[PDB]
């Protein structure tokens, strides 16, 4: 949702980081892209693919995620 508003300057986030072995400076370096949690910057280009296809909001993604669960379920 943050990415759609400005594709230029927003760093796509892959997912959150929860690695118990992290130290105090390990949180601040990986809490990047303006996030308050540690995360990984995405680099798979999935954002630019999903954008073109027409997804715009966070619930349009969740509606995509649930659909493959069902498609796998059959």
């Amino acid at each position: 949702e943050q990415w759609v508003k400005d594709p230029l300057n927003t760093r796509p986030i892959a997912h959150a980081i929860s690695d118990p072995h992290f130290g105090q400076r390990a949180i601040e370096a990986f809490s990047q892209a303006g996030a308050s949690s540690p995360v990984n910057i995405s680099y798979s280009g999935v954002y630019q693919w999903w954008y073109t296809q027409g997804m715009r909001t966070n619930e349009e993604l969740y509606n995509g995620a649930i659909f493959l669960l069902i498609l796998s379920a059959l």
């Binding site: 966070n58 619930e59 969740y62 995620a65 649930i66 669960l69 069902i70 796998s72 379920a73």
Partner: peptide, 29 residues
């Protein structure tokens, strides 16, 4: 996202829970 939908999709993934096991132990046989 939500909080109930997070738990909900956890319950959606339970449908591939027992069915992926049932695919396996019969492909074992």
């Amino acid at each position: 996202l939500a909080d109930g939908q997070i738990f909900t999709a956890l319950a959606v993934a339970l449908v591939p829970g027992i069915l992926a096991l049932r695919l396996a132990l019969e492909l074992y046989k």
